[PDB]
Structures are given as C-alpha cells and as structure tokens.
Design a binder for this molecule. Structure first.
Ligand SMILES: [Zn+2]
Length: 46
C-alpha cells in the first residue's frame, strides 16, 4: 500500500502537454487542445 488506501473517484487527469491537473477529464481534454497553437501565417502569404 502506497498511501493510496482511498481515492478511486476523482481521477486527477494530468496534462501531458504542460503537466497540470483538472477535476474532470471533460475540462482537461478541452485544454489539451490549447497547446495545438493555431497561429496565422507571417513570413508566408497564407
Ligand atoms: Zn496543458
């Protein structure tokens, strides 16, 4: 037992991108997309 007697309930989904945590996955998945970074074209004419 590794100081984990009780807990099974609120899976602390950690962001593999930054490394943060969220109470619910529905709040993390929507964040894991923030790293995508969709910046416009600069030096190129897009
Ligand atoms: Zn993140």
């Amino acid at each position: 037992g590794s100081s984990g007697s009780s807990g099974t309930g609120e899976k602390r989904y950690k962001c593999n991108e930054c490394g943060k945590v969220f109470s619910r996955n529905s709040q993390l998945s929507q964040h894991q997309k923030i790293h995508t970074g969709e910046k416009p074209s600069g030096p190129s004419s897009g």
